[PDB]
Design a protein around this nucleic acid. Sequence first.
DNA 1: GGGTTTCCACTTATTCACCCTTTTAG
DNA 2: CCTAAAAGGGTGAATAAGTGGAAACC
Length: 296
Amino acid sequence: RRESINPWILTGFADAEGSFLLRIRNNNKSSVGYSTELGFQITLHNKDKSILENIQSTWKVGVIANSGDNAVSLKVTRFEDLKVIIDHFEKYPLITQKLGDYKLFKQAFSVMENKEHLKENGIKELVRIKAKLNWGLTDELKKAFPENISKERSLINKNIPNFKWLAGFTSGEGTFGVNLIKSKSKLGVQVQLRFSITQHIKDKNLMNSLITYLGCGYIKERNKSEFSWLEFVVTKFSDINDKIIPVFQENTLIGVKLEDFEDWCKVAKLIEEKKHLTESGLDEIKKIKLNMNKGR
DNA sequence: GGGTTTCCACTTATTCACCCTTTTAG
DNA sequence: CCTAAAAGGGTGAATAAGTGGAAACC
Ligand SMILES: [Ca+2]
Ligand SMILES: [Ca+2]
């Protein structure tokens, strides 16, 4: 752990990458036949381990471990430590549908705080809570509690609270790219800066507000077969240079994605100076693109 | 102790990120 | 003609969520 993370940036990053967990596990050693585990977790690629360590030192809770060969995770399940998680998301609330999952996390916390999870009465309530959380109930767990159990919950419809949140959220779902377009120009290569944010259609309302909230961009309806998601995209350079860049200069990104923004800004300064029309500039832009994003 | 909590190892599905070329605008 | 802007996408893997196993605590 090194530095601390702004609380609203943390909530925005949690809106993007965090997830709440509730385990209801068969257990022959448990008086009620089941044991439980409640908490919150973030799984990232190895290269962003510094974010996990910064979150850990901000909250002073959580356990960092490997998550396969290429990922690393921060998990909070120590029950007393979950109070920190509750206190944070009460002061700095989530604004995506994940708020719904967090609200269920809170109900489960109340049950385990009353120690009711050690009685069949509490287990049954935890099953009702888990039925509306994330993937919901497995077929086995559903058959183990025959009663009628609702799986539906209230949709979340909230607004971007501030740029600090947007910087956290963008550090997760954002991308700063450079399109090399084969154009009918003299150089034969048009340089195009592209900024975009991706999100499932379950939060269409939040995605469309980005247009209004940022004063630029458009929405693209995408789908890979049976799956749908949205993509907010800005390609006009004046918007990128006047509206997108300054927002993130003043609300600093986190993770390696910050380096991608810094490099993205160099290309922006080149364009701004028209150096992107000279061949020496084009070669500098190619060098930058090669060493950012995957190429880094 | 023994029932309960906490942690580490590891997997799985799809929502992301990040990429491309072609077409149209101005 | 010329450059910027948008359109129209392709797709692998970093995410979100998850289970198995057990040391260890109260
Ligand atoms: Ca997400
Ligand atoms: Ca991410």
